[PDB]
From a paper:
The SARS-CoV-2 translates its genome into polyproteins that must be cleaved to release individual proteins essential for replication of the virus. Given that Mpro processes the majority of these sites, any intervention that stops this process, such as an inhibitor, would block viral growth. The crystal structures of inactive SARS-CoV-2 Mpro, with the catalytic Cys145 mutated to Ala, with 9 substrate and 6 product complexes were determined to sub-2.5 Å resolution. As in previous apo and inhibitor-bound crystal structures, Mpro crystallized as a homodimer.
Six additional cocrystal structures of Mpro bound to the product (cleaved N-terminal side of the substrate peptide) were also determined and comparatively analyzed. Our cocrystal structures captured the N-terminal product after the cleavage reaction was complete where no covalent bond exists with the catalytic cysteine. The N-terminal products carboxyl terminus is coordinated by the catalytic dyad. All 6 cleaved substrates bound at the N-terminal side of the active site superimposed very well, defining a “product envelope”. There were no major rearrangements or shifts in the backbone and except minor side chain conformers, the products bound similarly to the noncleaved substrates. Overall, the product envelope recapitulated the consensus volume revealed by the substrate envelope for the N-terminal part of the Mpro active site.
Numbering used by the authors:
A (entry chain E), B (entry chain F): -6 to -1
C (entry chain B), D (entry chain A): 1 to 305
Write the structure that this text describes.
Amino acid sequence: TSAVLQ
Amino acid sequence: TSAVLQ
Amino acid sequence: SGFRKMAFPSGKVEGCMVQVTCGTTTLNGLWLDDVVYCPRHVICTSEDMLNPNYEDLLIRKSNHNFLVQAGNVQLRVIGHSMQNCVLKLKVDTANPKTPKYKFVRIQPGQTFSVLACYNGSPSGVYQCAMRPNFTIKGSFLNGSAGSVGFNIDYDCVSFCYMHHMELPTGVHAGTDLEGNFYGPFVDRQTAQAAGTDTTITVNVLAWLYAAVINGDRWFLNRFTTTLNDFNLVAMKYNYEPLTQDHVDILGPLSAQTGIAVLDMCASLKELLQNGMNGRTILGSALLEDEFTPFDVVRQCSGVTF
Amino acid sequence: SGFRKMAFPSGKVEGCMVQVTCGTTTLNGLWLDDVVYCPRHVICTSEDMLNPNYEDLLIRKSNHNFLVQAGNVQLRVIGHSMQNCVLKLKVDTANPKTPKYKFVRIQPGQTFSVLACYNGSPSGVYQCAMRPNFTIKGSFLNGSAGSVGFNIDYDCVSFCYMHHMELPTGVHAGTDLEGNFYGPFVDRQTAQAAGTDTTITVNVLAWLYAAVINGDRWFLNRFTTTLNDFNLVAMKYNYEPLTQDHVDILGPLSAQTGIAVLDMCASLKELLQNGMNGRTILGSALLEDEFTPFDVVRQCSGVTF
């Protein structure tokens, strides 16, 4: 799954 | 053992 | 994602910490406006601590007996009084770093941050709960009395605990900031023991909700229970009874997850009777009870100060 | 006595946190002298975060596009450059609360405090370890990027981490203060995964020493072991092989408790092979590896800042 930029 | 005041 | 024991930022409290010395006895004080609050047993010698009469002992003291240091500057004491188990030392200078603050008395099962201090300097901060038996499982060495526990709401620091002593099982006892002890304990080195403790059920449920919010769902099931049936299981496992007020407090978490409280209670009942079968919840092999429902909302919502 | 995950007091770092907005994206920045440091993906729109061309994005950005707020003070951005995965925004004002500080790259296995922030404002503080797979097991939501990890020594804040992103297992990845990631991760919403993680053997031994200091002894007085026999077992359970350096590091705790490192190793060996059998150590049913030997010495001695 994609990383999430926070 | 007794209470210990800190 | 993630869920950690998270303490409040401590900066507002750090600027209130001072050191109080009386004789060869040193501990910490809390400097708010022109008053330093500290445990009264600072006035004790070592031989005084078995059966002190604090009224007598305080009568024997004067202002010049209290050396109060705010870092390097010595604050001159111009007045002293005793309020239950705390001393209020009036100083001639108001703390310019005094935050908006309240003194509150918390209930068993509520949490707070502790800024652990020695010689008026902070060593670290960590999160505690008031156990049902009115102790706290802290990290306190000699010299740490007068360290405070607190919560923040908006820009207001709510001081709820001042640390006094350690009981023989290694747990900790203290007062509110009006000097009233939490629990049936007294500040004297006599034989005292914490009552039997219990697990804080509403907090275990809150933490199970945190687990679901963070994608841990293996413990859920299709069952529901009644509140009465759940409490028959709770009593067997030394858990506090769950009240309808507790069900309501879990409302934000049941809303966010879609899992009714009595549905989660059926999960908890199964975890108690069956264990975890080698699995973990939020990195723990034990059911965690030192997060309140608000603590979960705060962390999972990003509440700031 | 007692032993807690204890974070450093956060007050020195709270004074450096600011809000950085660019377009619809807001995160945190770190304000030191006349520079605000922040993750570069503040210049992305939500349609740009799969394959961001950061060089081209920054081209179409000028100074007034970076809205920086410190409390209720607007800072003026007077210049911007991108360094690795961070932005360095030159502001027209120096931070008067800048502490003495260092930038460092921490090693896997070392720990640090995180000041989790939203909108430039502190939300909470907790302790983390840099995992061997270069992630951290934090508690971070959307908007937390730019929060920093740090250690304190006397009055010097060593910044070692700035947060950027969350991986699909719910762990976290970020950079040092030069903007260079810990681990093989990139600041894009591409498919990425944390590598296999190992347990920090030397930290587990330090925590066992912490537990002895605090009167837990049920796991002790095992038949002793040699290093190789210990490592044979350790690697079977995904523990890092123990080196003489690690043995050397544990000397101070070994000496203090009078338990030879290799005797602790033998206690750990037995714990790995037989588990704890429902029992607990320092409140945990799992072996804890996010306390370094210094963390233990620091908490059990009462070092202050």
